[PDB]
Design a protein around this ligand. Structure first.
Ligand SMILES: [K+]
Ligand SMILES: [K+]
Ligand SMILES: [Pt+2]
Ligand SMILES: [Pt+2]
Ligand SMILES: [Pt+2]
Length: 235
């Protein structure tokens, strides 16, 4: 009955990944003008970087509670789940993710943060959610190219994987999962590869074009969303 215990009960169902319980508890709160409880749960999930926040939102979305997602989460959730054209902006550098024009053979086009363009159709992507085994994963489609962001099999001397945009998806290498974070008033996301569980990042090495190559990073990112996380802007 009191709001804090309703908040705890909601948070706890999501923590244990009982999303059907989270959804039902949420539709109840929402119908009763207790969006406060729901918003507070999301804020809490996000402060603690709980990945399960993503599955919660997606289940609300699939179970006819798109309103809750729109009204009680960071705008980025609606942007992600409505598959709106968005820009992927790396917080550390304020560069937009894009693809090259020429191909890298079978791996496809090279993915990088562009030194100059953060506004043309080139920098436009969409998230395409999918559900498997109680998780939400995303394909990340370059809209100008109709190519999917992927990690290549190869690694650098650090064990980092190059990122590319390719035609097909018979590999978890083309799938990603998200973990929300905060920094100031900014909601951000670590974007991890399903195959390698490495976070999508931009290289600290600058190309002379001002471009920075995109990589699945072999290292710890957590705790530092201002260096390793992404923001999602309406395009
Ligand atoms: K169910
Ligand atoms: K009630
Ligand atoms: Pt209210
Ligand atoms: Pt190549
Ligand atoms: Pt390059």
């Amino acid at each position: 009955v009191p709001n804090d215990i309703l908040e705890e009960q909601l948070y706890n169902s999501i923590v244990v990944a009982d999303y059907d319980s989270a959804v039902e508890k949420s539709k109840h709160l929402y119908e009763e003008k207790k969006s406060e409880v729901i918003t507070n749960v999301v804020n809490k999930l996000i402060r603690n970087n709980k990945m399960n926040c993503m599955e919660y939102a997606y289940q609300l979305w699939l179970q006819g509670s798109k309103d809750i997602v729109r009204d009680c989460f960071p705008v980025e959730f609606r942007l992600i789940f409505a598959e709106n054209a968005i820009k992927l902006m790396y917080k550390r550098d304020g560069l937009a993710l894009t693809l090259s024009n020429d191909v890298h053979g079978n791996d496809g086009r090279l993915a990088f943060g562009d030194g100059k363009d953060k506004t043309s159709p080139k920098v436009s992507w969409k998230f395409i959610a999918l559900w498997e085994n109680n998780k939400v994963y995303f394909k990340i489609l370059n809209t100008e190219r109709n190519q999917y962001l992927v990690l290549g099999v190869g690694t650098n001397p650090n064990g980092d994987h190059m990122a590319f945009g390719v035609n097909s998806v018979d590999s978890f290498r083309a799938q990603w999962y998200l973990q929300p974070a905060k920094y100031d008033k900014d909601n951000l996301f670590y974007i991890y590869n399903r195959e390698y569980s490495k976070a999508l990042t931009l290289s600290r090495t600058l190309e002379t074009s001002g471009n920075r190559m995109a990589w699945g990073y072999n290292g710890r990112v957590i705790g530092s969303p201002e260096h390793y996380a992404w923001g999602v802007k309406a395009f």
